[PDB]
Amino acid sequence: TELALFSRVNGKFSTEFQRMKTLQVKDQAVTTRVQVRNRIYTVKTTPTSE
Amino acid sequence: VQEDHVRSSFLLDNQNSQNTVTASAGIAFLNIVNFKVETDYISQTSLTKD
């Protein structure tokens, strides 16, 4: 600010603004399935075959 | 004979900080009838981790 009635009447407003908005989302999904089946039903050769 | 296990794990974080700094002035009656100074400053930080 400034004022006077004799020699020095002025005005000033050196207003400033600095804003910096930074976001950082970071998502990481990971799925891993493994599944295994087994069956048996056995068979032998007869001990007297030719 | 059948069986199964489930093991969920859920770990969440957060650090939501803040700042606010302000200054001021106002030396004004003599040799300068008016000049005013004030700065402002605000900072935020919000970090979530799950």
Side-chain angles (χ1 to χ4, degrees):
Chain A
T1 309
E2 178 58 30
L3 171 63
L5 260 289
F6 294 84
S7 311
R8 287 178 171 177
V9 54
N10 303 326
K12 188 164 197 59
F13 297 97
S14 160
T15 85
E16 260 192 282
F17 270 90
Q18 276 82 244
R19 290 191 285 183
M20 299 168 51
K21 296 201 271 196
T22 75
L23 295 97
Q24 281 204 11
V25 192
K26 176 193 183 189
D27 194 348
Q28 276 198 185
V30 160
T31 317
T32 292
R33 321 182 188 187
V34 164
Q35 65 86 20
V36 35
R37 266 83 78 93
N38 281 320
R39 330 272 159 188
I40 87 169
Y41 157 44
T42 177
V43 170
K44 296 279 190 70
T45 182
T46 192
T48 176
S49 70
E50 317 166 348
Chain B
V1 170
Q2 87 161 289
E3 71 190 21
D4 62 332
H5 308 72
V6 182
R7 272 175 272 265
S8 283
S9 273
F10 179 30
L11 160 67
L12 191 138
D13 264 23
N14 191 317
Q15 301 204 244
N16 187 15
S17 56
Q18 207 157 7
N19 295 156
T20 290
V21 167
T22 310
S24 300
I27 171 167
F29 192 84
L30 290 90
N31 298 24
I32 293 95
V33 290
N34 260 317
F35 89 93
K36 170 65 83 170
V37 169
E38 62 172 1
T39 77
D40 201 26
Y41 180 79
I42 57 172
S43 167
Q44 314 214 22
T45 287
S46 102
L47 176 141
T48 43
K49 280 164 52 182
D50 54 357

